[PDB]
């Protein structure tokens, strides 16, 4: 399992020394992370349009996955 919470050294919400969060924030960066914290569940991170449905964050995830 990797150990990177974000992907930026100048990010204060992430300790480049470990690549994880530096503060007590639940996340430092992610389409589902607001204010360095996990957004609530049902966060439309990906609104896939067409013959596919949309995508909502589980409220505990930081970034946003896809349908498959």
Swiss-Prot record:
Annotated function: Inhibits platelet aggregation induced by ADP, thrombin, platelet-activating factor and collagen. Acts by inhibiting fibrinogen interaction with platelet receptors alpha-IIb/beta-3 (ITGA2B/ITGB3).
Domain Disintegrin residue range list: 1-68
Species assigned in the record: Calloselasma rhodostoma (Malayan pit viper)
Superkingdom assignment: Eukaryota
Full protein: residues contained: 408 to 475 of 478
Motif Cell attachment site: where in chain: 49-51
Name the UniProt record assigns to this protein: Disintegrin rhodostomin
Disulfide bond annotation, renumbered to this chain: 4-19, 6-14, 13-36, 27-33, 32-57, 45-64
């Amino acid at each position: 399992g990797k150990e990177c919470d974000c992907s930026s050294p100048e990010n204060p919400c992430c300790d480049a020394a470990t690549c994880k969060l530096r503060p007590g924030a639940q996340c430092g960066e992610g389409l589902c992370c607001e204010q360095c914290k996990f957004s609530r569940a049902g966060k439309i991170c990906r609104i896939a349009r067409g013959d596919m449905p949309d995508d909502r964050c589980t409220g505990q995830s930081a970034d946003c996955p896809r349908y498959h």
